[PDB]
């Protein structure tokens, strides 16, 4: 529930470093693909488990 982004998925580190003002990312299907950790700024991908 990062800053109100409710969902379910597996979090994993990635090299997709966002911009300093950007918070989360989306794909061509308007689905959230990655989000940053508001405690320690790191990009974590959001993918369905199985």
């Amino acid at each position: 529930n990062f800053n109100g982004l409710t969902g379910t998925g597996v979090l994993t580190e990635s090299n997709k470093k966002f911009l300093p003002f950007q918070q989360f990312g989306r794909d061509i299907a308007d689905t959230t693909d990655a989000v940053r950790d508001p405690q320690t700024l790191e990009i974590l991908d959001i993918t369905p488990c199985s």
């Binding site: 003002f21 950007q22 918070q23 989360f24 990312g25 989306r26």
Partner: peptide, 26 residues
């Protein structure tokens, strides 16, 4: 002292593709 004010207008000086900002933090 507040008595001075100068300005000029022409309704156009340039017209290019600028002023595009990030609409969201996505």
């Amino acid at each position: 002292q507040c008595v001075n004010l100068i300005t000029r207008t022409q309704s156009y000086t340039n017209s290019f593709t600028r002023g595009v900002y990030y609409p969201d933090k996505v």
